[PDB]
Design a protein around this ligand. Structure first.
Ligand code: SAH
Length: 225
């Protein structure tokens, strides 16, 4: 494992020290994201390779439905889902200004919550859920609880689409300069993670990131019976 650029601006380096505890890490996570959005360093928002994941989830729903956007950022995917007729709940640690014009355009069809995914209450509220680059930044000890919340929030026939950084070789854990964690996955590794979280993968796509010279891995799953 060697340091490498993960996006236009950020080089990430393999973690070699003991990780910050999950409680401390939550603050590191919020701090980096709020600074990045404030500064306009959210280079993911306008990356063209980020657009296929939402269309993939819609294809697996096939109808207007109720969709959770977990880690929704500025709302690009939320707008995409609303344009298909979905009702959407968008959740993020950081509330950006762009949620207001979206609320104006879509009214009661969109709901926004500026909270961690883990704070979402309820069960069986959504037909679909999209994680477009959120899970792969969580503390590894929090993957299970994060995915279990998604799993519980989905209805029995729910679909979950997740996009992560694709690894070249066995996936490793890295950190950016602000100490945000980045996990890259192989397809077997991501499938194994989902199966352990009681999801059964039904599709997976390697989405090129041409300007970054990398790929996203976009996997869709149902609940395991
Ligand atoms: N535990 C958590 N709960 C809610 N949002 C989180 C989170 N951890 C990270 N995030 C948010 O996850 C997003 C990852 S960046 C991707 C943003 C958006 N999905 C897009 O497609 O552009 C950031 O907006 C970050 O603030």
């Amino acid at each position: 494992a060697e340091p490498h650029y993960i996006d236009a601006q950020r080089a990430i380096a393999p973690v070699d020290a003991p990780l910050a505890a999950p409680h401390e890490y939550a603050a590191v996570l919020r701090s980096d994201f709020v600074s990045s959005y404030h500064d306009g360093r959210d280079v993911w928002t306008d990356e063209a390779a980020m657009r296929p994941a939402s269309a993939i989830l819609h294809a697996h729903l096939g109808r207007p439905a109720v969709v959770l956007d977990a880690g929704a950022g500025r709302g690009r995917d939320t707008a995409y889902f609303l344009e298909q007729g979905h009702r959407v709940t968008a959740v993020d640690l950081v509330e950006p200004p762009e949620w207001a014009p979206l609320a104006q355009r879509w009214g009661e069809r969109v709901r926004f919550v500026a909270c961690p995914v883990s704070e979402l209450d309820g069960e069986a509220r959504f037909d679909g859920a999209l994680d477009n680059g959120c899970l792969h930044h969580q503390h590894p000890d929090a993957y299970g609880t994060y995915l279990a919340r998604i799993h519980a929030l989905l209805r029995p026939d729910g679909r979950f689409t997740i996009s992560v950084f694709e690894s070249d070789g066995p996936g490793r854990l890295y950190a950016n300069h602000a100490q945000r964690l980045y996990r890259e996955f192989t397809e077997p590794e991501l499938a194994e993670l989902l199966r352990a979280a009681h999801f059964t993968p039904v599709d997976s796509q390697r989405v090129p990131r041409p300007k970054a010279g990398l790929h996203y891995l976009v996997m869709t799953a149902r609940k395991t019976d």
